[PDB]
Amino acid sequence: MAAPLPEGVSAEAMSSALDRFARIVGADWVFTEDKITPYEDPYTISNDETEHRPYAAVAPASTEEVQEIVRVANEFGVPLWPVSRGKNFAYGGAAPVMSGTVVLDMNRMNRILEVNEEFGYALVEPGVSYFELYDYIQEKGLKLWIDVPDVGWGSVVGNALDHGIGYTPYGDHFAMQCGMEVVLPNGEVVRTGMGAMPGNNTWQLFKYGYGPYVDGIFSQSNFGVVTKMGIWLMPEPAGYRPYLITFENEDDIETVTERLRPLKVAGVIQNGATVRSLVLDAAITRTKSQYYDGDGPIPPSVAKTMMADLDLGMWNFCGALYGPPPVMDTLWTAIRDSFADIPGVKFYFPEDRRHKVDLLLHRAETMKGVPKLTEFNFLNWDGGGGHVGFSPVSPITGKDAIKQYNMVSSRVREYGFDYMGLLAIGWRDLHHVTVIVYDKTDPDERKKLDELFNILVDEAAAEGYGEYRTHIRYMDRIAKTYSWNDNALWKMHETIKDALDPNGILAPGKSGIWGKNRR
Amino acid sequence: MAAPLPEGVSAEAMSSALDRFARIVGADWVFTEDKITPYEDPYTISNDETEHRPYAAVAPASTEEVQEIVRVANEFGVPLWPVSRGKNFAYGGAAPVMSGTVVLDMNRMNRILEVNEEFGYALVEPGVSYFELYDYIQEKGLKLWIDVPDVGWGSVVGNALDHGIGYTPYGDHFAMQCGMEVVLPNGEVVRTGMGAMPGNNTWQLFKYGYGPYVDGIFSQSNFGVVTKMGIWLMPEPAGYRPYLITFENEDDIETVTERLRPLKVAGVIQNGATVRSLVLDAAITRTKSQYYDGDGPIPPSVAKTMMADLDLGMWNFCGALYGPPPVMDTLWTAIRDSFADIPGVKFYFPEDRRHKVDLLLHRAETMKGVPKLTEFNFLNWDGGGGHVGFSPVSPITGKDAIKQYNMVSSRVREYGFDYMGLLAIGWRDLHHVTVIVYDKTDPDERKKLDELFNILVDEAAAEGYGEYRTHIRYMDRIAKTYSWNDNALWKMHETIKDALDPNGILAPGKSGIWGKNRR
Ligand SMILES: Cc1cc2nc3c(=O)[nH]c(=O)nc-3n(C[C@H](O)[C@H](O)[C@H](O)COP(=O)(O)OP(=O)(O)OC[C@H]3O[C@@H](n4cnc5c(N)ncnc54)[C@H](O)[C@@H]3O)c2cc1C
Ligand SMILES: Cc1cc2nc3c(=O)[nH]c(=O)nc-3n(C[C@H](O)[C@H](O)[C@H](O)COP(=O)(O)OP(=O)(O)OC[C@H]3O[C@@H](n4cnc5c(N)ncnc54)[C@H](O)[C@@H]3O)c2cc1C
Ligand SMILES: [Cl-]
Ligand SMILES: [Cl-]
Ligand SMILES: [Cl-]
Ligand SMILES: [Cl-]
Ligand SMILES: [Cl-]
């Protein structure tokens, strides 16, 4: 079933806009009909084939083409969904919230404008992948690391703008951003920070520049199209020691989170702390069929086999030490002593692991910024599928951690899915992350998934736990949880949207923000 | 001599507003006539007495009184100048850009709403001083440090919003901000981040919340009135070692900046690096008259007597080590060895300083977040004066440091002032900071000051060095240096200003931002 037209746009307006788009980028860089397939969400949730359907895609080569495209979108009221590389799998891929939206795919704007070793930064266009930035650095022998999600075909820009995370000390991608160029919804171009100063050499050295700090308003946003972005890069460290701490009991997560709190608040653990459930970690190297025959989620007897077999606990804390050995030894003493008295705890460094293909060896690559695509193998746990996550924010306490594990594993298993969870800590923020793998081809699984997801959001919100990043299908739902003072915050986002984008042509419904023409 | 009415506002409109303000906050907290004196800039620059003249001040007790004052302001078209404590000495104090603006003084809103030890944060109203928050922490025995901008009587909120800086690893005050409550220009109230979720306990734990990141637009801004603000607080570390490294030769600053760069990018130096000129450091414990009776800048023979008398160099680098001894020793080895081979270099710890009142003993207090008013001593160098500062951003290069030292020291000395200066480094950002001490009572000195200041701006901008914070007199002048693409960035600020504040009643001219009614 073909995408419907966006409401308020005629066949003739759409036909005219797509031909005008083709005059700007070339007929070969406007995609309709059979060539739209890759812009669909690969992990379908809806059973309604009229939802989240991109009408076409346009793939520009430059900021100047983006500006022209934006002006044509305003001329015809044809809305655009900007993507850097459009690999936002688990969140909708390249697909828009509103059917009939045209994808603006900036994949071909893939110039690495600068990599600066002595100041540790890069200035990149949206099409630059983590693979590409990593290869450039390696090729040029620069003593810099990148910070990669578990998945390396993504965008250094796109991932950061969606408040993406990785597994080095530079793991908060948007916090490491510094300077951007934006095409505003009127088609005019602006630079933030020191980029506003002609002849500056400081665009990537100082975030604020002068006056209001606005870079943030173009993250998780439909206020602009980002065409260049700076990012800080970690200088190669004097040493690197990745580790795995395993815990034998499901209830250990309570005391583990209590012990993690001071180590994370003080910065003794130098990267994000990630504590993964047994099945989430097993799914890298194993399938359910190799330990259990049921079509249901696993029983506890299986869990015990997997633990001894894979040298994993019910909870698996991956982290890493960075810097000269005397620093790494001192921090390690602090971290190890924090967990040594827990019955059944085990400590591993890479040389301590007895398997060739191993969770610590796999996570050790990500914790030093090596981009890969091996993480997608976890989707084969239950025969093959898509994934979606729920990652709300809570205080770093044992009580909050065990409450979420209990609430979520209960609900997920009620709907026929194995519980795959982790407790993640950035700095002062805990996230219980629910990872759900589903057969996206099965209408009944899709219906169960949607119904489950809505229960997780509601029960989390009732405890004061709010989502920070979500799939196109739930962007309205998450926005409505942020309801303080009768939705005061979204009223302010709406005022800013109407000011910058009076015709509502950028990404209708992104982050639950809709302009005056569609509200 | 009395302040003029703001243009467009009648005596009747003003008198009605003031009558309504008195009923909102009480007659004892609307200040007119003789009681306006404290709201004048204490360090006058302009010789035109009709400039930067507040008409009156209102001191509300609560967010509800702020909302009512803002609605009254919209009713009568009376503009407001929001200050948290108005201690912005060197930037115009509590005085507005535009004469006849009424000061909205929130010093009486001084509740410490929360200090959380296990998560290391505070939630504060704008009237909370560094002195008050430090005294609160000390009395309850909480193992937390604050970060002070050497001006104990200032606002935790107000300083952060103006992008203020201190001397611990938490020195970027606005970077450590997390959650705020803002009264918007229509008098409606909003909470950013996790504060938009009813029942959250995460407002001070996670900056972003969901959707666009907007806290930044209320910093160095007239988009809103901040009434509550969270800030991250450093856990008391396992150890603290403040140090002073002196350089004999003014030309040493070139090689010193070169060696500082990798140490700062990599985080081996854990706080801001501050490299202060002889006179700036000497003026802390001595006056010019102790060494030289002439009215001109000191000569070189006097500089050398001062260096020998005080154990100071032409350049004085104060920094501190934080954390467990084995970490501090490792970082000290790298820092020490970076400078050991410079002829004339000297290394001091507190126990190495002979003088009882001593640069390093005062700086050691600031670099562990002990609030003081010691820093004001440099105003007595030439018998008593005010100060203004020029603090543009540059790359951390010897060539940029020595260029700025030569082009500024020559000009300031040319106009008859002693050069007092420093090279400060945040993380990747160099600042050559010019401190100009002048007789604020003397119209001739004021005129030489204004002339010198304008030359320093133009010569800096010609090199691509832009200011990040300035005095109310120069806010339009600095805005105009950020002129990339025919002033694109300020056209965007103006679009947001007109959307949030259609009647232009918040702080007209803050950061060179004027609404449509005044532009
Ligand atoms: C197995 C697996 C593992 C994953 N691991 C991680 C992980 O560790 N960490 C993580 O963060 N994510 C992870 N993800 C989620 C996701 O796949 C990645 O974050 C991915 O990199 C995002 O796609 P992208 O980088 O191509 O960004 P894009 O798809 O290009 O951008 C994402 C969104 O940002 C906005 N946007 C992008 N570019 C612009 C622009 N120029 N202007 C304006 N708005 C723009 C749009 O709303 C767009 O839809 C994982 C997913 C899976 C399935
Ligand atoms: C000798 C000397 C040393 C100094 N040392 C330092 C230093 O080391 N570091 C440093 O950073 N500064 C320094 N200063 C500058 C200044 O004195 C301090 O930064 C001081 O703390 C700022 O005043 P305040 O905290 O009362 O802020 P305020 O005066 O209350 O606020 C400053 C500005 O921010 C805005 N603002 C404040 N509150 C709000 C609000 N609630 N809503 C909206 N806008 C608001 C307004 O535009 C206001 O004018 C120094 C000054 C002198 C003379
Ligand atoms: Cl460029
Ligand atoms: Cl819209
Ligand atoms: Cl409160
Ligand atoms: Cl510590
Ligand atoms: Cl205005």
Automatic annotation (TrEMBL), chains A, B:
Give GO terms for biological process.
Answer: lactate catabolic process
- Gene3D superfamilies (alphabetical): 3.30.465.10, FAD-linked oxidases, C-terminal domain, Uridine Diphospho-n-acetylenolpyruvylglucosamine Reductase, domain 2, Vanillyl-alcohol Oxidase, Chain A, domain 4
- List residues of the FAD-binding PCMH-type domain: 50-236
Per its UniProt entry, which superkingdom is the organism in?
Answer: Bacteria
Task: Locate the residues binding FAD.
Answer: 81, 84-89, 150, 153, 155, 159, 165, 167, 226, 387, 469, 510
What Pfam families has UniProt attached to this entry? Answer: FAD-oxidase_C, FAD_binding_4
Keywords from UniProt, A to Z, are: FAD, Flavoprotein, Nucleotide-binding, Oxidoreductase
Q: Which SUPFAM superfamilies match?
A: FAD-binding/transporter-associated domain-like, FAD-linked oxidases, C-terminal domain
Among the GO molecular function terms of this UniProt record, one is: D-lactate dehydrogenase (NAD+) activity
Q: Which PANTHER family match?
A: ARYL-ALCOHOL OXIDASE VANILLYL-ALCOHOL OXIDASE (AFU_ORTHOLOGUE AFUA_3G09500)-RELATED, D-LACTATE DEHYDROGENASE
Q: State the protein's name.
A: Oxidoreductase
